[PDB]
Paper text:
A key regulatory step in the mevalonate pathway is the ATP-dependent phosphorylation of (R)-mevalonate to (R)-5-phosphomevalonate catalyzed by the enzyme mevalonate kinase (MK), a member of the galacto-/homoserine/mevalonate/phosphomevalonate (GHMP) kinase family. Distributed widely across eukaryotes, bacteria, and archaea, the mevalonate pathway consists of seven enzymes that convert three molecules of acetyl-CoA to isopentenyl pyrophosphate (IPP) and dimethylallyl pyrophosphate (DMAPP), the isomeric, five-carbon precursors to all steroids and isoprenoids. Each MK monomer consists of two domains, where the active site lies on a surface cleft at the interdomain interface. To shed greater light onto the mechanism of MK and to further investigate archaeal MK in particular, we determined the X-ray structures of MmMK bound with the substrate mevalonate and with the product 5-phosphomevalonate.
In particular, the structure of 5-phosphomevalonate represents the first crystal structure of any MK bound with its product. In the 5-phosphomevalonate-bound MmMK structure, the mevaldyl moiety of the product is located in a similar position as in the mevalonate-bound MmMK structure, displaying the same lack of direct contacts with the enzyme. The phosphate group, however, interacts with Asp138, a catalytically important residue discussed in greater detail below. In comparing the mevalonate- and phosphomevalonate-bound structures, there are no significant changes in the protein backbone and residues in the active site also do not display significantly altered orientations, indicating that the transformation of the substrate to the product does not trigger major protein rearrangements. Our structures of mevalonate- and 5-phosphomevalonate-bound MmMK align very well with each other, with root-mean-square deviation for Cα atoms (rmsd) of 0.18 Å, indicating no significant structural differences between the substrate- and the product-bound enzyme. Once the phosphoryl group is transferred to form 5-phosphomevalonate, our structure of product-bound MmMK depicts few structural alterations upon product formation. Although we cannot assign protonation states of all ionizable groups, our structures suggest that the negatively charged phosphate group of the product now interacts with the now-protonated Asp138, consistent with its proposed role in deprotonation described above. Notably, fewer ordered water molecules appear to be bound in this region of our 5-phosphomevalonate MmMK structure. Although the poorer resolution of the 5-phosphomevalonate-bound MmMK structure may itself hinder the visualization of water molecules, the presence of the phosphate group would necessarily displace water molecules that were present in this region of the mevalonate-bound structure.
Numbering used by the authors:
A (entry chain A): -1 to 301
B (entry chain B): 1 to 301
């Protein structure tokens, strides 16, 4: 008869977004922007977050409701009160939906003693995102479960960079599905042109793998800038993203690029700790909601 | 008193990749350099820069044109008055245009009898003497006009579109920009060289789109080309702001034209949306020049 709190981090793409869906490598990096889910025993099912208080509700709380629906089939959950707080803004490729999924599983696993392992939690989180989105990659829930720097799809763990991470949100809503659809149709229109560009994005991630293992942050940011041009060439860049990205580079960032589907949302700037604040001021001065964070090895943890 | 004009040009696709044996598509625009040539007591060359004599410093291309040509038919009193609406830099062909417009103006009065052929060979050999070394592409496109592929040098039909050139006002050294791309290519050759091939592939596809008049596909291939150049590091904030403002205003496509690092962008518009696009580029802070493609190179005005 008590309460339990769990948190799971978000992530940013160092390299390789959009190209993964065509079988190329990418490098995801968990950051210290987390979603907390606090769980208590209750008479009925209640979920409260930024967008209000609901019961079981697949319109407002689809991921948390799906988690409850699934896990109640092994150990029955007749009542629970879940409170969701997050530093990960819904939108862009920061993994907010995967963070709340993993944290909801972790809290319930602790509250009702499901005894699930971290591997089982990541596998369950992937299935939750499939039943909510129709089809989902296991990448988001895996990185939010284990933290750190993970390559996709090999799941190679790399050394977490001793770096600052500046996230500039353009405020435009990043609708992932249509941007992935826009890239696919561009790929279909010019196959011999776009498909090699997908090979080049994968080539960047494989080169960047050693640079992440070597700690060469200046080379990493340089390759991030090359990755940004290819993402721009694929059509997922916008004026606001370009303005935040170039403002961050001018203020001394190693590199800056879109993170996620693009077409709005957030960019990411890898900066040395000494340059975080002035990079954050430049992105803000360019009209961007700035978040100063850093990578993390901590995935799902019990608060 | 005669007057001749030669046009500038813009790159539809392929800049920066031509050095590494790739294809490019230049398109002459209706921005021309017109020089008045008449008879005078001394060889006087006037411009917006000023009125001088035979000055190989303030008038490098015009004065060198005088020297190479007078060795066949001696000239001693000409009043050259260059006038141009071609912005300086960004490979817009300002130096190439002022060259052939001078050669054609002297070929008129003093009767040199040069072909259109010869006005291109001499117009390129003179750029070899002025800036030490130069490519004949900038020169030829100013002589014939229209859409010209490089290096295959095939002429294509002119797209019935508008051209919005947006100057950022930022200076950039093309020598440094080419060398920077060169260093990046040698730092990651297995990565950057395929990007050079992709640019050339855009030019090959774009050739069929220029022939078919698929202006919308040309524009979206321009947007792809722009991302590749941005990946090579030749893009800046000001260029990106002008490019995306043109796209949001309805242009078929927008991209850097020339070396990048500043300088000018270019936007392909439907003829009706040409002013709407130009207003957005100016509203984004660009020095706008409204123009359109031309099929005529050097003409005796
Ligand atoms: C759009 C995509 O390329 C990256 C964005 O990831 P997310 O859906 O924002 O978590 C998805 C993928 O790579 O599979
Ligand atoms: C980038 C580039 O295509 C720009 C050409 O402009 P210009 O007419 O040479 O000034 C030159 C190059 O191919 O390196």
């Amino acid at each position: 008869g008590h309460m339990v709190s769990c948190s799971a981090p978000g992530k940013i793409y160092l390299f390789g977004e959009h190209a993964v869906v065509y079988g190329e490598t990418a490098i995801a990096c968990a950051v210290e922007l987390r979603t907390r889910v606090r769980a208590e025993l209750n008479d009925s099912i209640t979920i409260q977050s930024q967008i209000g208080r609901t019961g079981l509700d697949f319109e407002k709380h689809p991921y948390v409701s799906a988690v409850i629906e699934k896990m109640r089939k092994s150990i029955p959950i007749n009542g629970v009160f879940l409170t969701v707080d997050s530093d990960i803004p819904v939108g862009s490729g920061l993994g907010s939906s995967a963070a709340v999924t993993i944290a909801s599983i972790g809290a319930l696993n602790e509250l009702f003693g499901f005894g699930l392992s971290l591997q089982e939690i990541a596998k369950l989180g992937h299935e939750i995102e499939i039943k909510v989105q129709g089809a989902a990659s296991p990448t988001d829930t895996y990185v939010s479960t284990f933290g750190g720097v993970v390559t996709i799809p090999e799941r190679r763990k790399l050394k977490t960079p001793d770096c600052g991470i500046v996230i500039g949100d353009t405020g435009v809503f990043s609708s992932t599905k249509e941007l992935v659809a826009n890239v696919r149709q561009l790929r279909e229109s010019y196959p011999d042109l776009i498909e090699p560009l997908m090979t080049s994005i994968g080539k960047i991630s494989r080169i960047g793998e050693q640079l992440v293992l070597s700690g060469d942050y200046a080379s990493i940011g340089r390759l991030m800038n090359v990755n940004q041009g290819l993402l721009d060439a694929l059509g997922v860049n916008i004026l606001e993203l370009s303005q935040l990205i170039y403002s961050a580079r001018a203020a001394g960032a190693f590199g800056a690029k879109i993170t996620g589907a693009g077409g709005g949302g957030c960019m990411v700037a890898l900066t040395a700790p000494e340059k975080c604040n002035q990079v954050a001021e430049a992105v803000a001065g360019a009209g961007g909601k700035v978040t100063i964070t850093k990578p993390t090895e901590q995935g799902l943890k019990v608060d």
